[PDB]
Every structure is written in C-alpha cells, then in structure tokens.
Amino acid sequence: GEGMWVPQQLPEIAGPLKKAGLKLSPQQISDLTGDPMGAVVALGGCTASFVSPNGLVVTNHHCAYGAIQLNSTAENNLIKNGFNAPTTADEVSAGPNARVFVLDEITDVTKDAKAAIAAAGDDALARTKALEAFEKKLIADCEAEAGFRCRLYSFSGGNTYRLFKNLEIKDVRLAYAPPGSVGKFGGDIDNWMWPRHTGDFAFYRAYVGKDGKPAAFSKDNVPYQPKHWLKFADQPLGAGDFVMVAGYPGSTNRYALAAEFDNTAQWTYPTIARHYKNQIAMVEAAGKQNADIQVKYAATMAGWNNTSKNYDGQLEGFKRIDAAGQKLREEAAVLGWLKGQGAKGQPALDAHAKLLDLLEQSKATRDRDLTLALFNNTAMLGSATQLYRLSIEREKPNAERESGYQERDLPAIEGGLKQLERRYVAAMDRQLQEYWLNEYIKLPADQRVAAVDAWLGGNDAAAVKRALDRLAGTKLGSTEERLKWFAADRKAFEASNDPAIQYAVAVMPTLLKLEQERKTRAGENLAARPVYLQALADYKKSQGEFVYPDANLSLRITFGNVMGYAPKDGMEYTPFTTLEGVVAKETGQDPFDSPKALLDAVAAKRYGGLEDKRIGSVPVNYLSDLDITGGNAGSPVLDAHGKLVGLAFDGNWESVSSNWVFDPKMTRMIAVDGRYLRWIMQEVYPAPQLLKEMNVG
Amino acid sequence: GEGMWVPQQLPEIAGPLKKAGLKLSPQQISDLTGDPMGAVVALGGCTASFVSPNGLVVTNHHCAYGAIQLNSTAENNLIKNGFNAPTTADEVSAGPNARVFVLDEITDVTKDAKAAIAAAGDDALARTKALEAFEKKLIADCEAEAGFRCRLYSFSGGNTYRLFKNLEIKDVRLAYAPPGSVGKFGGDIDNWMWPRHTGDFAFYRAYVGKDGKPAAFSKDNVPYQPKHWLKFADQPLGAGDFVMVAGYPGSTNRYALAAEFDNTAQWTYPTIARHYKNQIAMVEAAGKQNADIQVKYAATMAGWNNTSKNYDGQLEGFKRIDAAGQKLREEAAVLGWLKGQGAKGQPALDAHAKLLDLLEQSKATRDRDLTLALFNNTAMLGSATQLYRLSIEREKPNAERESGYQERDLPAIEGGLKQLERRYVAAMDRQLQEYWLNEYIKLPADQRVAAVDAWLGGNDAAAVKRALDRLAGTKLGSTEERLKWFAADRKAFEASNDPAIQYAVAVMPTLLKLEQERKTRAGENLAARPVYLQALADYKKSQGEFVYPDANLSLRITFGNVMGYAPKDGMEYTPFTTLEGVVAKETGQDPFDSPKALLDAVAAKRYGGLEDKRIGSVPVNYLSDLDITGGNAGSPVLDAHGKLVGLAFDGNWESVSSNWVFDPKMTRMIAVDGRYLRWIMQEVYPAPQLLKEMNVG
Ligand SMILES: [Zn+2]
Ligand SMILES: [Zn+2]
Ligand SMILES: [Zn+2]
Ligand SMILES: [Zn+2]
Ligand SMILES: [Zn+2]
Ligand SMILES: [Zn+2]
C-alpha cells in the first residue's frame, strides 16, 4: 500500500505492518544497520543488497548494464552471452566510477541544523546560505575519516535532518549476468508493461584492501565481508502474501499544493514534452544524412524520448483518476479543518498562503527560467557558462564555493569536457542553439532578459540568425580548447573575444541573480514548508492515518501484498507470470529471443525443484502493491520473515505518476522472482558456485 | 464440462452431477415433461422457455429480432426503441411462421425402427429407403392428431430412435424487447468476444384458441397455460457455482474418425471459405455501382461472410490445440484396445474399416459434389432444378415422394419462388453462374460429369461464355414465370426450349444418381456407424468415462460451473462483467450507444436491489464451461436448484470449434445474467407488469 516509511517510524506503524502480514518485529527491521536492513546498499542511482558473507551483491541487470558493457567487445560480447566468473579471480572490474555504499552510522542533527538556520534569522536568502554552510562543514568533518561518504538529508520540509555516514566501496567487480535476452527479454516493447517476463538481475562482488579499508581496483584487493546479508526464502511466495521492499527512492512530491500540482500538469510537463519532441524530430531528420550526427546524439535523443514519453504518460494518468480534482478536494478539507481550529490553526494557514505566494513568484518567470536553462545546456554555451562560472568560484576559498564547483567536483568537470566530444556535432548543436534562441524570441515579452537582448543585438529572427553566425566562430568545439579554459582564470574569460565566452560573460550577472532568486524562495520554503506539512500530518492523525515523508534518497521501506490489478471490466492481470509465458512470446528475433537452453528446459519441464504448486510452474515476475519510484530499481523484495523473494525492477504503466500519487487499485511494482534467478542459474546459464555460495546449490 | 446429455441418462451421471453442485435429484430433471424441463421449448432454430403460468416465454433478442423487425417501421422503430406491451392486448403478432413447440410425449421406437431397417436387409440403398419409409409413416400417424408436430431422432448412429410429439403453438406474440442498443450492445464488434456486455433477451407470449388447441393468429385467441414454467433464482449466482443449460443443440461431430476430421479441416472448410470469400469480393465490387445489387445481395453476402469467418476460426482453433493430433492419438488408442480384445473386438474393427471406405468413396468425388451443388444453388438454375424435380416427384403418390417435395412442402416452395425476387439481380447472378462454371471447368478431370460437358458443348472458357449467353435467354428471372413452372407437369419441362429448364432436364439424371450414391453410403453408415460408436462407448467405460450422443436437435442438458479462462500468461478473463463495464464502452455511436436511462442509472448507482456483493455491481454477462452449439441460443441457464440465472446467447471465440471438440480450459458459453434482465426491466426500459407476472416486481 501507499508509503515510503523511514525505518525509525516502523514501530509506530506496527499494527498496519502486522495486519499486512509481517512476521518480524518492527523493532528488528527499524534498525538500519541490523538484520536485514544493513544488507541493503546503494549503488548511486540503483538499489542493491548483500547476499553472501563474502561480499556478493545482487541488483538488476539494467543497473549493471554499464559495467557489463564496459567489459564487452564484439569478440567477447557479454551483453549478448552473459557473464559468469567461476572463481573470484575471474571477476572483472565494473569500472572506476562503480560504488557500493554501505551504511555505517546515522545521526539525527535536526537541532544543530535548525539552529544554524535560526541563528542567522529572519532573512530568507541568508537562511538558505546558513543551511548550505552547515551542510558543507558537517560533510567535511564526517568525511575526514577516509573511506566514507556522508550525506545530509532533510525530511518533511526540514522538520528533521539526519546525517548518514556510508562506507564507500570503490572496487566493484562483476560476478555474473545472465544473457541479455533474459536480462532484457522484451526490450523496450515490454518496458513499463505487464505481463512481464524479464529476468532483470545481475551480481557484483564488493572488494576492499587487505587492511579492510576501501581502495580502488587492484589485484591485491580482497572481498569485502559484510556484517549482514540476505538469504533466499525457504517458503514459496504466493498471491496475497506480504512483501516489503527496502531501497533508496530519489524523490516524490506527494504533498504538493493543488496549485503546485496544476502548474506541473498544465504547464511544466506539457511544455517540456513539446520541447523534447521537437528536438527529437530534428536529431532524427539531421541524423538520416549525417550518420555521425545520429550516432553521437543517440543517447541524447533517448533521454528526451524517455522524459517526453514519461510526462505524457503521467498526464494521461492524471486524467484517468482526476488527480487535480482529488488534490483540490483534499486540500479544501485540510484548510476547512484548519479554520476549524482557533488561533491554533492560523500558522498553517499563513504558511499555506506564503507557499502559494512563492509559487506565483516562480510562475511569473517560468518560461524564461526554463528557456535560459535549456539554452545554457547546449554544448558550446553550457561549456562556456560552466567554465566561466568555475573561474569565478575558484577565486573564493574552496569552502565558500558553490556546490558543483569545488575541489572535489574538478575531476567530474574535466571528464564531462572530454565526454562532451562523443555527443557533439557543430552542425547539430547549431540547430539546437537556433531552436532555443527562437524559443527565447517567442517568450512573453515580460519574461525577456535585457542582458540577453543586449548580447543578441535585438530580439527577432534576424538578430538570432546573426548571433548563430557570430557563435559559429567559437573555438570551444575543440576538447583541447575547453581544457585550456578549464585552467583559465576569470580575467582571461572577461578579455576573450571568443563569441561563446562573450555570451557567458554577458549573461552571468543575470544567471547569478536568478540563482539568488531561487535560493531566496528556498529560504522562505524552509520556514513555511515544515509548518504546512506538520499541519497535514496533524490532520491525518485526526483521521487516524499515519504519514510518511516524501522520498529524499534515504533508505525507505514500503510494504503490501502480492496482487494483480484489473484495468478493465471482465479481465484481470494475475499476480504471476510463468516459464511457459516466456516461451509463448518467443519470436526469436530481438527482443523476444530467449536462449535455446531456456526454450529446451521449459519444453522438458525442467523446473529444477523450483515449481510453485499454486501456479504449476516456476514463477518469472510478479505484481504487488508496493510504492516505489526512481532509485528503487534493484531493491530486494523481502517476505514476512525478511527473506529474499525477488528484486524490484519496474512498474506497470499506472506507476508512471509515482512522484505525485499512489493509486491503491492500479499502481503496481513488477519484480523478478528469486526463484527465477535460481532457475536461470541452474538450468539456463549456470552459476553453481554462486548458488553454493548463497546456500541454494 | 463436456457433454450434451440426454435427460434419460441423467440418473446414470448422478455422481458427476452431484459433484459439480447439482442439488435437485437427477430423477427430477430427467423428466422431459416435468419440473423444470417441461418449461423448455423450441422455437425452430433457437431455444426458449416458459416463465409464467400465463404463457410468457423468454429467449434471446437476436432470436426475436425477425419478429421485432416485422413489427417495426421508421415511424415506430421497435429495433431502436424497444417494445413493451402494458397489457396482453398490446402484444403484437410475431408472424405466421413463428412457433413454440412444447413437448407432449416421447417414445422409444428403437425396436420398430431397427426392424424396418433389418427387414429389408443386406442391401444398403434399400436400408436407407426402408428407414425413410418408416419415418414418413410414423410422423404421418403421430401428426394425425391436429395441433402436433412430430419428429423422429436417431442417436449415436442409430443405436436408439425416439419419437417426439410436440404441441405446435402457432400464435406467438411479442411482449417485450429491450432497445437494440441493449439487446445488441457491441454489435458485430463484440460478437464471439469476451468481455461482453449485451442484454440479449426478449419475451414472447404463446396463444391458443378458446378451446385450448393450437390456432393461427386471431384476436379470439387467449394465452396458453403451460404446465411448467421457470422461476428466477432467489440465490445470487457467483464464480464457481453450478450451472446447467437445457436446449436443443442442432449437430455435433465429436466422434468423427480422424480421417473424417482431416478431410474437413484440410479440404472442406478451406475450400468453402475460399469460394465464399470470392463470391463476397464480387458482390461488394458489383455492389458499389449498382446500388440495387448491393441491397438485394446483402443478406446473401452476410451469410457467406459468417461461414467463411466461422470456418477460418475453426481452422485456427484446430491448430492452437493440435485437434488432428489428439484425434489420431485417441483413435490409435481405441484401435489398440480393440485388437486387445479377441474375436470380440473384430466387428468394430470391420465397422471402422468400412467407415474409412465410405469416406474414400465420398472423397473421390468431393470437388464435383460441391461444385455441382453450389452451381445448382444459383437463382435460375436452383429454381429450374427444384421445379423440374417437383414435377417428377408430383407423379408418385405423396407418400413415396422425396422429403422436401411433398404436399406439406408446397407452401414453403411457392414462398421461396416469391422471396427469390428480393435477392436476385440478373447481372449479379450471371457473374455467379460464371464463377461456378469456371470452378467446374477447373475441376480435376476425373470428377467431370459427361452430362454437364454435353450440355455445355465442351469444357473450356469458350464453352462457358457461350453457355452464359445461352442462359441469359431464360425467362425464369420473372416470379410469374417461376409460378407458372411451379404448376407445370414434367412433359412441359421436357418440351421446354427455355435454356434454364433445358439444363435442369439435362443434369437431373445425374443429380438423381448422385442422390442415390449418397443414400447408398448412408445405408452402409447405418450398419457400421452404431457398431463403431458402441465400441467407443465400451472403451470409454473401460477408462471409467461416460459418453453422450452427438447432438441431433433433441433436448439436452449440459452442466458445469461459472468460470473464466486465461488465454495468456499473466492475465485472466473474469467470469462476470458489470454495469460499470457497459458504460466504460460507451461511445455512443452504434454499436456502443446505450440508452441515456442506462447511463444515468449506472452513474447514480441505482442497482435496484440486484447488486451482487462479490462483484460490487449488477452482473451483466457471465462465462461458464457449459457445452453448447448452434440451436442453444436462448437456452435457460439454471442453477443447482433448477432456478433461472440467465440465458445462453453466444460463445467465446474458442467455442467456434464446438462441432468437433470441447476444450475444458478455453471453451466457454456467454450468458446474460437474469439479474441484468430484471435490472433493465426496472431501471432502463421498464416492464413492471411482466416483473409482477414473474413474481419479481
Ligand atoms: Zn513465521
Ligand atoms: Zn546477518
Ligand atoms: Zn508440477
Ligand atoms: Zn439447497
Ligand atoms: Zn411447475
Ligand atoms: Zn454496493
């Protein structure tokens, strides 16, 4: 059911947990470094979990796909064939940027955070600056012990702050991946869809140095020995059974004001989807003649195509359930209730009014803010603005520098400059500059920027065509040139007659103002947001409900049951798929082309001891009413006793609105059953050593 | 489950009945004139049932559609608006050809039948003639009492013969029909499909004369008073509940030899579907310019389009389940078993061999037999051959005349001659003569008919074009001319220089030979068929199974349970549809255009006391594993206590092979729930008087 619950509040929702089917105490699962939550690790963008005392880590195949790809060549194509390391020495590096973060300590720092906010008071902008400041110092201090990465997270509008210190494992090796036609069966056709038949799993192993401290890749490293790890279920999972997921959902906005929501649904999402569709059109079209354009923009267009399709999906989902109506009605009920109280209710009504003010402020300049951001996200101008900005930031003490522009950020920046080249064609990027300058000249005139008009030398298509011509003389199309500028101080920027650099110098005063306008609204949100949210929580209590905080990249538990859904009268989606269903989709050309050993095993009914009696086959994937979102890929699904019964890997189409709502009747997670993991590793692409290692061989 | 059981064998299948859920004794439902089977009536082509002591009869809306249409004008359009008779005087005639047949007496005449076959022995053709003879006399005698129609039916290859004497009610009036957008919701789009949301019901009332004997329509008639009638369930029907249907399925061929089946599936069905598709192509094409062609051929093309689509459906269903394989395997097992016996098994092996002989005989001339039949089914030549044939038959005593060509048949013949005109255009029919003559010249030469080649004056396209030209001089395109010939004796036929008539005179000796070849194979089938079938029954017993006879237009009981099916992994069709599902399909243009009072009632949740708690709405249609086929439309669905819970009206797509197999996992009947009948009659198109009459008002 609905909710991304923090571990610390589990004892408080004991009754609902118990009622859903949980058999462990809330106390035991409320311990983030205990059994089993201390087994759950973050990979940065994906969830994963320890599954052996010798550092074996399980996650999705699409989470590991970069690692797998990195180790693949046409000659030895792991993507297609799968990968299996018979001994730990056979295991291959996932790359320098691969991580496993294991929780080591949590601290509640709410009082210190709130003081640094308070003690620098009344002034919104300075409130935002004092919180930044507090944060940068806390992390610096916490990260003084080498081998740790620390993060500070704010809950429910900054009602609570917690510091997480994580062991940062930096040598991650690939141990196993099924063939791609298992790990990605159905491809893009079956994405977001049920029925699903995708074996979306893979295994890493975590390594440390002989001294037990994190270390970069080295053949002197040895497997990390986790304190906790998960074990495979010994009871079969069936329809109605309790399940729970632990993972790191990135963000939700479940408590947004009705007007905030209307703004996104009526302006933000349609606007961004239109832009993205337009840029896609132009890449494909340019792309059919070049061929260099269509290879270098390929990932770019895929990213825009996802978001475009995602937003369009959400917008349809909103209509389906009248999202904006329900939000309006609930909100009226909360305001009604607050008026209900006396003087007591006034603070929350104020906070609400203020939030509505802040919303109008940001709406006044929304076309401009968006257009400018995306224009500055084109290759030569992004490059120019980022580097000039770095040059300004470099002149303050590292501690006073803007996050993203610090010592620690420098390798990431330098890397993007190089990476840039793989996705940049001058002819293409000029069409994209054109596109965005034309969006800028079409803005409502009250959101023009005098600075930008000044640099353009006007505000119509003729000024734009001139500026494009002027800009084609930049040298920043060259990686050398960009690293040159990477090194340059700001007087060099302000003396440059390179037209990309002159743009950056001309717009930066404006970019900085807008930044400080954002931080000012944030400083205000800091005061009003927790107060409004506290009142939502109070009103929920009065209806006997519990509340959970919006997701914020911290570990959460969602719980519920295995169950299907019915999108139409006379029909139901059943909670499980089976082996025979994989085979019935076989074409086999991509993406419905299973390995021959799979086709044969299912044809022989070689179920390998894993058959579930209730469905009469080995289950493949399943549906349940858990509440997950981006960041939960790879998350372990556990049963009523804390044992591993699957991995989260996708949602059904009706999950696409997870940022905004949860629909008890239709929102479902799609998991791959742990029995399918085992079956694949027994009968199709065998990993006897790993099964032996996990006590199921 | 599988089986169309005759009432007399129900006590013998007591255990399976009891186990499925039946709560009445087998004894009670085995009585064809008792409670409730004596309520079930035949309409000629459709099933129906008495539902009141005052003669009210319920059936499907598509069964009553002719009656409804007959009473409709553009001004007063019952098809669209529905019809409701507030008093019995408001009830309107269903037409002179409408019937309700009520069972009055059954007799087992097996011994007399078998004697007349035996006593005229050894000779196959004469066996066929003696059975014809026996039959014509039995019926004549039985029908001596005015007001009765009698029928003789042969069971399991003529192992048993029963005589049914039925009261023939001839004044049938329409009492109620819902609007067409209920009675035919979904139209042709939802035909053969689930999910289904069609209120396919209508009500007649049966009338007799003031003396209680059948009579043709007259305002002096009064309602017939049936001895038994059905009552509406007082328990809600749910998933898994026992259901049974009683009705008059026309024909099945469940025990066909594997080779008989291969012949149909590999030759008959594909051949006929091809022909029908070709003739359709030519009607549409000619039809777009005429407009008179496309109106007069409209029903013709619909008939060909059904059969074509039906056959294509069956052929796909056969592949889906490997029908030909299963038949082969079962058959091998039966032959195996028979060899298993000693001398005892030899008669059945002989019978089988003989059946296989008879099959080869008919296969030797199958292209010819088919081509000639369909050529003689064109308007001018059918007309010519039927009338010449009548002229020959007229010269023997009525008793010795061929069935179809007797005194009793004469009005039917005269009517077709007139009706002909509504579906005949000379230009069109000439293209159809052309089509068929070209099929004839393309035959394998070993199936040519010297007679036909003789009349053509050759056997190629030039002879065909000449014959078409010759034939366009017929006068039989005129209804007058045809009635003229209706009256004519055979010397007049044999002296005619009308080219249609000259064809008839030239081919008749051949048509008569082929007829006698058919009756000869039949006479043989009479001896070998029951013996093979008896051995199938014996082999079934040895596996502990019961056997049912192929359908033959007599009353049968099928039983089973309410249940869905799952055509694909991860998905199921649920056994019920609901009101909200009707509304969710609303477009409303035809055929998804429900009455506004339906849309409003569902929107208000005016469930009228009929809501089933398990589904949370009023059920609309449901699925079950009963075994029905053509003739079962309108059949009452009864529950475990013999109460009315619905009417059969269609099958799911996987039912399309009902003539040949039954698939326990996929074959389903679609019924309209009796609660939906009541709901429509309470909330949408009200019939309070009828609900009061049936004790649910
Ligand atoms: Zn237990
Ligand atoms: Zn442990
Ligand atoms: Zn099994
Ligand atoms: Zn009872
Ligand atoms: Zn009765
Ligand atoms: Zn209700």
PDB file of C-alpha atoms and ligand atoms in Angstrom, chain A residues 35 227-229 231, ligand 2:
ATOM      1  CA  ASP A  35      19.293  -7.676  10.202  1.00  0.00           C
ATOM      2  CA  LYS A 227      28.105  -7.808   8.622  1.00  0.00           C
ATOM      3  CA  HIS A 228      24.619  -8.571   7.251  1.00  0.00           C
ATOM      4  CA  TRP A 229      23.421 -10.169   4.030  1.00  0.00           C
ATOM      5  CA  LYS A 231      19.022 -15.126   2.454  1.00  0.00           C
TER       6      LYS A 231
HETATM    7 ZN    ZN C   2      23.105 -11.046   9.479  1.00  0.00          ZN
END
